[PDB]
């Protein structure tokens, strides 16, 4: 109820807000920050505090606990994020849904973190004042991911953030880089076609002045998805050319970024490059914000990889608990693997609708070819000369006349490495392959060895930097 | 003896007669008083469906949950509790080591009858801490194994197996290893490693005494078939077929006697026919055999590979006759196997020659490197990003 809730809400707010604030004030020190911001800060603000303890809308108290921003517009984020449905898109609060301010209680104490309202609020050209107001901004809009709320940030409730920003800190941008991600999402979830660009574009200009890779990088990615879904293909295509993405970027922003690029490549007809980026994306973030995203990654994963020429097992996919999204997908994997052209394309044509939202749909057409190609590949390697009639029956080709032409097209690329005799009706294997040779096994070993180096350097560089920092500052 | 429960259990699980088998299957738990664990146990057992309990129907009508199962459970538990109390209290007044030990062995044996896996570990440890005869100690572990197999989840048995391993070494009793060996084989048939299951089953047949076995006759029939899966023809011919040991073990094999003959003769046609039959009669019956796919693949590879390995040429007509399988079918099955290239053969349908490359060179050893190499490639990278964040 209301008396108990208010107390509970202030005490949780204060602890979380004070810590968050304390890191920016110290100033960005990159090595130390990277561990602090990734695991700790983001996770406590998002999952741990808001959801647990009293209700899941601590926000009416949150405004009164500490200053959001000086106008009553930010103070009325009890009317721009509880306004829609019943207390936003989250559990029912006991706290008052009111215009201007909720209640009238001011537990802003004399404490700096706890911030009195005329005192911090002014949106200074000094970098300090925007920086605390943004820390409070972070917690409200990071809820958006948990909630899946729509149009309670599309209107002023994070359009407001632009006004707070004046000069901005370099230190500010690393944390602000997380807030920006959430601004896009609210419009993008419903697939609203309202002005995502203005706010993100505004943030790009400051971030370049400050020299913080994380903030400029994170905007390029969000932007890329907004446009693709919208069917503003041209903007999305151009944007990729800036390319910046630091290692101190968050695990969710990386997985999102890899997926988006993966789509752009795949239609251009870089099946080879597309496959690689998308596979990396599933792997790099196991995370917890990733869970929601991973299902999307699995949809694309199965279609791209099959076009490139490799087959996976239906068995692999079924085992994880994201199983529910893989289910239509099991039919497709099997179709390519058995060698069943007719089953594979028909299923995919109807399925094509779902992909259109993503803009993956242009690929679905090209997919008819790949099953026949996968099929030919198993037959070519296996045999020496096998007759044309045998290949037509197994692969499930249309007729014997279809079968000669199609097998030929695969052959040209060279991954099959055969010749087909049209007037003699057999295919011959140019493969007489073996790695029993002179140098050839080293070549096989070489790729593994190259890849290891990238791991070794990344490891070495990273390993020393966190313990030396803790001895330097607070060692706990 | 408790091992009989398992034998019966495979039959309602597989399709070969569902309904009738269920009553009989249900009775052995009915006496033991299995109730608390029973509802949870049915779900796990399934890997070819059909529940051994009344808590689900899959393929046919299920037998009902008898009242006797509940009544025996309550009566046995009440008794065990009365007995144990006098002993635990007496233990303090008297020698700590002796009195508690005798009490604990009994208490454990009843907990295992319910099938409480947790109650079996707690009961076991106290006895071990105190003085206890090495033979007597080791015997106890057998019950804990029987419940894991009963449950027939791969995870649960792996935990039991780790404990069993530490314990056998301390006591040093060989009579006890034999009973342990059987449980170990029973789990092995259940997964993808029949190769391992074959060794365990063979050693035990030669010298066994009838304790912890479901029926010697069924067990001997089964043992020979498993040896084939692991063992290719040059080993198989000597050990099983012509060997001294098979007579000593005693004969109940004939469907299998013909099976071994077909590989030795170099007449494969009858091998394939028998393969199909062996899946229906042995495997289904038995509770243990999931991922049936492995069994089939290996057996079929064995036949193909032995002919091909010996011969770099055969003509197509001869090759087709010997194999006794249809032409499209011989090709398709092989196609999977050739990719791995431990066989590594081509088939002509224009030259009418089936060629075998037969690498025993750098090719052979290198191909395996690649497959292992893929698994290592994903793991290392995944580990690197998780730690960085």
């Amino acid at each position: 109820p209301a008396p108990q809730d208010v107390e509970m809400k202030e005490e949780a707010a204060a602890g979380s807000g004070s810590a968050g604030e304390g890191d920016g004030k110290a100033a960005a020190t990159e090595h130390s920050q990277r561990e602090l911001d990734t695991v700790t800060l983001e996770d406590i603000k998002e999952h741990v505090r808001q959801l647990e303890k009293a209700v899941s809308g601590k926000e009416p108290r949150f405004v009164l606990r500490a200053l959001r921003m000086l106008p009553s517009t930010s103070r009325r984020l009890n009317h721009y994020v509880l306004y829609k449905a019943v207390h936003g898109f989250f559990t029912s609060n006991n706290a008052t849904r009111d215009f201007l301010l909720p209640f009238l209680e001011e537990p802003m104490d004399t404490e700096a973190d706890l911030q009195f309202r005329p005192r911090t609020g002014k949106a200074a050209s000094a970098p300090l004042l925007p920086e605390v107001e943004a820390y409070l901004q972070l917690l409200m809009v990071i809820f958006l991911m948990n909630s899946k709320r729509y149009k309670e940030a599309q209107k002023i409730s994070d359009d407001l953030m632009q006004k707070i920003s004046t000069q901005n800190r370099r230190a500010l941008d690393l944390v602000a880089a997380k807030c920006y991600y959430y601004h896009a999402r609210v419009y993008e979830f419903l697939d609203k076609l309202d002005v995502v660009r203005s706010f993100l574009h505004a943030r790009l200009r400051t971030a370049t002045l400050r020299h913080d890779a994380d903030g400029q990088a994170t905007l390029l990615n969000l932007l890329l998805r907004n446009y693709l879904h919208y069917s503003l293909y041209d903007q999305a295509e151009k944007l990729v050319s800036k390319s910046v993405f630091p290692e101190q970027a968050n695990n969710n922003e990386w997985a999102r970024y890899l997926y988006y690029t993966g789509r752009i490549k795949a239609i251009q007809l870089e099946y080879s490059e597309a496959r690689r980026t998308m596979t990396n994306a599933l792997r790099k973030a196991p995370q917890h914000t990733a869970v929601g995203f991973k299902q999307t990654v699995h949809k694309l994963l199965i279609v791209v990889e099959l076009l490139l020429g490799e087959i996976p097992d239906r068995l692999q996919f079924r085992q994880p608990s994201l199983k529910r999204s893989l289910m239509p997908y099991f039919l497709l994997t099997q179709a390519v693997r058995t060698g069943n052209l007719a089953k594979f394309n028909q299923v995919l044509d109807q399925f094509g609708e779902k992909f259109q939202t993503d803009g993956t749909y242009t690929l679905i057409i090209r997919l008819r070819h790949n099953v026949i190609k996968t099929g030919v590949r198993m037959i070519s390697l296996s045999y020496s000369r096998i007759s044309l009639a045998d290949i037509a029956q197994k692969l499930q080709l249309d007729s014997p006349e279809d079968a000669e032409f199609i097998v030929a097209k695969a052959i040209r690329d060279g991954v099959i490495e055969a010749s087909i005799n049209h007037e003699k009706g057999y295919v011959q294997s140019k493969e007489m392959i073996d790695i029993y040779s002179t140098r050839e096994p080293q070549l096989a070993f070489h790729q593994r060895i190259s890849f290891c180096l990238d791991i070794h350097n990344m490891s070495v560089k990273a390993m020393r930097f966190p313990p030396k920092s803790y001895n330097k500052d607070l060692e706990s | 003896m408790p091992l009989e429960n398992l034998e019966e259990e495979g039959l309602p699980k597989n399709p070969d007669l569902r309904i009738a088998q269920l009553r009989f299957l249900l009775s052995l738990p009915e006496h033991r008083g299995d109730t608390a664990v029973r509802e949870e146990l049915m779900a796990a057992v399934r890997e070819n469906n059909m529940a051994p309990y009344y808590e689900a129907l899959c393929k046919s009508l299920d037998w009902q949950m008898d009242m006797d199962l509940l009544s025996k459970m309550k009566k046995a538990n009440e008794e065990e509790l009365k007995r144990l109390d006098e002993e635990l209290e007496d233990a303090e007044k008297n020698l700590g080591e002796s009195e508690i030990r005798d009490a604990m062995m009994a208490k454990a044996e009843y907990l295992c009858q319910i099938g409480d896996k947790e109650g079996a570990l707690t009961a076991f440890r106290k006895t071990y801490d105190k003085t206890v005869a090495l033979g007597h100690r080791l015997d106890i572990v057998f019950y804990l194994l029987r419940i894991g197999l009963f449950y027939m989840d791969n995870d649960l048995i792996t935990r039991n197996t780790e404990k069993a391993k530490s314990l056998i070494e301390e006591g040093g009793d060989w009579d006890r290893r034999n009973r342990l060996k059987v449980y170990q084989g029973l789990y092995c048939v259940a997964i993808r490693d029949f190769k391992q299951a074959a060794e365990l089953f063979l050693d035990t047949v030669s010298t066994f005494t009838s304790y912890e076995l479901m029926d010697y006759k069924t067990f001997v029939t089964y043992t020979v078939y498993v040896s084939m899966i692991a063992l290719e023809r040059p080993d198989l011919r000597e050990k099983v077929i012509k060997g001294a040991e098979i007579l000593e073990v005693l004969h109940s094999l004939p469907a299998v006697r013909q099976y071994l003959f077909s590989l030795y003769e170099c007449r494969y046609s009858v091998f394939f026919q028998s393969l199909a039959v062996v899946e229906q009669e042995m495997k289904k019956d038995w509770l243990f055999a999931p991922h049936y796919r492995y069994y089939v693949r290996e057996m079929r590879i064995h036949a193909y590979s032995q002919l091909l390995e010996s011969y770099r040429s055969l003509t197509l007509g001869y090759m087709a006759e010997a194999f006794g399988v249809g032409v499209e079918f011989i090709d398709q099955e092989l196609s999977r196997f050739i990719a791995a290239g431990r066989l590594h053969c081509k088939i002509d349908k224009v030259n009418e020659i089936v060629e075998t490359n037969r690498p025993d060179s750098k090719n052979w050893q290198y191909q395996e490197t690649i497959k292992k190499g893929d698994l290592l490639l994903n793991r290392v990278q995944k580990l690197s990003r998780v730690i960085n964040m």
């Binding site: - | 046609s269 026919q273 899946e279 089939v296 693949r297 006759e321 006794g324 399988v325 249809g326 079918f329």
Partner: peptide
């Protein structure tokens, strides 16, 4: 095709009978 073993039970029986009558 999830597992080859179900299909294979029918295949081996069927394939032998036809093949035998004809060639072997």
């Amino acid at each position: 095709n999830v597992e080859d073993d179900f299909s294979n039970q029918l295949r081996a029986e069927l394939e032998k009978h036809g093949y035998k009558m004809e060639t072997s």
